[PDB]
Design an enzyme around this catalytic site. Structure first.
Site, mmCIF file in Angstrom:
data_model
loop_
_atom_site.group_PDB
_atom_site.id
_atom_site.type_symbol
_atom_site.label_atom_id
_atom_site.label_comp_id
_atom_site.label_asym_id
_atom_site.label_seq_id
_atom_site.Cartn_x
_atom_site.Cartn_y
_atom_site.Cartn_z
ATOM 1 N N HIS A 226 -5.425 -6.847 0.684
ATOM 2 C CA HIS A 226 -4.746 -6.535 2.034
ATOM 3 C C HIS A 226 -5.679 -5.556 2.739
ATOM 4 C CE1 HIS A 226 -1.352 -4.105 0.426
ATOM 5 N NE2 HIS A 226 -1.310 -5.117 -0.586
ATOM 6 N N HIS B 21 -5.281 4.643 2.352
ATOM 7 C CA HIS B 21 -6.196 3.295 2.710
ATOM 8 C C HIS B 21 -6.089 3.241 4.432
ATOM 9 C CE1 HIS B 21 -1.757 2.864 3.155
ATOM 10 N NE2 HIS B 21 -2.083 2.012 4.130
ATOM 11 N N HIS C 116 -6.084 0.541 8.096
ATOM 12 C CA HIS C 116 -5.895 -0.757 8.775
ATOM 13 C C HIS C 116 -6.914 -0.640 9.807
ATOM 14 C CE1 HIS C 116 -1.864 -1.217 6.966
ATOM 15 N NE2 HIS C 116 -2.086 0.293 6.704
ATOM 16 N N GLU D 145 -2.261 0.453 13.883
ATOM 17 C CA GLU D 145 -0.997 0.034 13.832
ATOM 18 C C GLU D 145 0.209 0.654 14.794
ATOM 19 O OE1 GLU D 145 0.188 -0.054 9.451
ATOM 20 O OE2 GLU D 145 -0.262 -2.174 9.934
ATOM 21 N N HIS E 154 -3.986 5.886 6.542
ATOM 22 C CA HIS E 154 -2.595 6.258 5.800
ATOM 23 C C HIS E 154 -2.833 7.073 4.757
ATOM 24 C CE1 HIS E 154 -0.669 2.926 8.528
ATOM 25 N NE2 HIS E 154 -0.861 4.049 9.047
ATOM 26 N N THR F 190 4.373 -0.198 6.309
ATOM 27 C CA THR F 190 4.038 -1.374 7.294
ATOM 28 C C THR F 190 3.599 -2.661 6.630
ATOM 29 O OG1 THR F 190 1.788 -0.766 7.542
ATOM 30 C CG2 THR F 190 3.418 0.463 8.950
ATOM 31 N N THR F 191 3.583 -2.861 5.331
ATOM 32 C CA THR F 191 3.445 -3.870 4.823
ATOM 33 C C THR F 191 4.674 -4.368 3.893
ATOM 34 O OG1 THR F 191 2.194 -2.931 3.012
ATOM 35 C CG2 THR F 191 1.072 -3.805 4.610
HETATM 36 N N1 LIG Z 1 5.189 0.647 -6.799
HETATM 37 C C1 LIG Z 1 6.434 -0.261 -7.111
HETATM 38 O O1 LIG Z 1 7.225 0.087 -7.924
HETATM 39 C C2 LIG Z 1 6.581 -1.314 -6.316
HETATM 40 C C3 LIG Z 1 6.200 -2.590 -6.848
HETATM 41 O O2 LIG Z 1 4.703 -2.345 -6.895
HETATM 42 N N2 LIG Z 1 5.858 -0.818 -4.970
HETATM 43 C C4 LIG Z 1 6.695 -1.241 -3.720
HETATM 44 O O3 LIG Z 1 7.711 -0.973 -3.735
HETATM 45 C C5 LIG Z 1 6.077 -0.528 -2.518
HETATM 46 N N3 LIG Z 1 4.839 -0.387 -2.364
HETATM 47 O O4 LIG Z 1 4.447 0.238 -1.164
HETATM 48 C C6 LIG Z 1 2.998 0.179 -1.040
HETATM 49 C C7 LIG Z 1 2.718 0.709 0.458
HETATM 50 C C8 LIG Z 1 2.949 -0.132 1.448
HETATM 51 C C9 LIG Z 1 2.615 0.247 2.835
HETATM 52 C C10 LIG Z 1 2.205 1.549 3.054
HETATM 53 S S1 LIG Z 1 1.904 2.054 4.616
HETATM 54 N N4 LIG Z 1 0.761 0.943 5.187
HETATM 55 O O5 LIG Z 1 3.305 2.024 5.355
HETATM 56 O O6 LIG Z 1 1.342 3.251 4.608
HETATM 57 C C11 LIG Z 1 2.131 2.604 2.119
HETATM 58 C C12 LIG Z 1 2.324 2.048 0.696
HETATM 59 ZN ZN LIG Z 2 -0.968 1.598 5.830
#
Ligand SMILES: NC(=O)[C@H](CO)NC(=O)CNOCc1ccc(S(N)(=O)=O)cc1
Ligand SMILES: [Zn+2]
Ligand SMILES: Cc1ccc(S(N)(=O)=O)cc1
Length: 258
Positions: free
Chosen positions: A62, A92, A94, A104, A117, A196-197
């Site tokens: 992603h 990371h 986007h 975003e 981010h 956001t994912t």
């Molecule tokens: N680590 C865990 O126990 C679980 C399963 O693997 N993971 C999550 O429940 C969430 N993972 O979230 C990543 C994530 C997603 C989006 C962002 S953003 N784009 O909002 O910064 C920043 C981190």
């Molecule tokens: Zn992000």
């Protein structure tokens, strides 16, 4: 998980496996600069990255994540709107297929070419997996990228991307200083939101810097050479890995600055 950013698995499909996609505190949002209220009670951000320990860079299918050692308070975010101490786990980006989209968050409906981010978790919950289950579990520092002059501190990231072209590839990425990705000013907007994912969990205090960073066309073009696919699979360029703005609902965006 088979979500992504295609016509068949993109943001408009996510709600079918992640119903919180239609929730009350989803991210990103449009920041309407005239409606955001200056809050004189907001503190300056404290970004303490002097002892940051980067370890590895991963193409997760992603985006790419630059991962840090978060086993001690080495790189932490505090102050601003936050109570307590948040540890940097990864950053990371986007980005878009062209410079006119990719962010975003938007600012008065303006889309930037990309958005960085820096993801931090609240140490009071002990581990990232526990923190994402809490409404104050994460603090994400968002930084807009515009295309102009090169960002010298980004080039080490750009140059390792050829080694992680496809999903599941990682490379050693030690001694990277994320302070080289910040703008001059730490003026910010803040609001309560979400990842956001998928899984789109409503666990984030968003802190979005007003001042963008400049990156060169050549730097962002190298982001766009990455692949969503795994090795030997049909090539799908990793572009347009952004979720569009979601309804603000019953939220206030606050400004740190007049
Ligand atoms: N680590 C865990 O126990 C679980 C399963 O693997 N993971 C999550 O429940 C969430 N993972 O979230 C990543 C994530 C997603 C989006 C962002 S953003 N784009 O909002 O910064 C920043 C981190
Ligand atoms: Zn992000
Ligand atoms: C085939 C398929 C499409 C989209 C998803 S979703 N709701 O996780 O975005 C899952 C599977």
């Amino acid at each position: 998980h088979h979500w992504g950013y295609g016509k068949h698995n993109g943001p408009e499909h996510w709600h079918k496996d992640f119903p919180i996609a239609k929730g009350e505190r989803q991210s990103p949002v449009d920041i309407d600069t005239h409606t955001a209220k200056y809050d004189p009670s907001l503190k300056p951000l404290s970004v303490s990255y002097d002892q940051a320990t980067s370890l590895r860079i991963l193409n997760n299918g992603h985006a790419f994540n630059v991962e840090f050692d978060d086993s001690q308070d080495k790189a932490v975010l505090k102050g601003g709107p936050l109570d307590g101490t948040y540890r940097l786990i990864q950053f990371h980006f986007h980005w878009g297929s062209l410079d006119g989209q990719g962010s975003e968050h938007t600012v008065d409906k303006k889309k930037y070419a990309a958005e960085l981010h820096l993801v931090h978790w609240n140490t009071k919950y002990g581990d990232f997996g526990k923190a994402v289950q809490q409404p104050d579990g994460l603090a994400v520092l968002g930084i807009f990228l515009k295309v102009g002059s090169a960002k010298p501190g980004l080039q080490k990231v750009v140059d390792v991307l050829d080694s992680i072209k496809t999903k599941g590839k990682s490379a050693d990425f030690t001694n990277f200083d994320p302070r080289g990705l910040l703008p001059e000013s730490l003026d910010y907007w803040t609001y309560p939101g979400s990842l956001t994912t998928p899984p789109l969990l409503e666990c984030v205090t968003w802190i979005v810097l007003k001042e963008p960073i400049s990156v060169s066309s050549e730097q962002v073009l190298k982001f766009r050479k990455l692949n969503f696919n795994g090795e030997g699979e049909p090539e799908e360029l990793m572009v347009d890995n952004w979720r569009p703005a979601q309804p603000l609902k019953n939220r206030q965006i606050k400004a740190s600055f007049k």
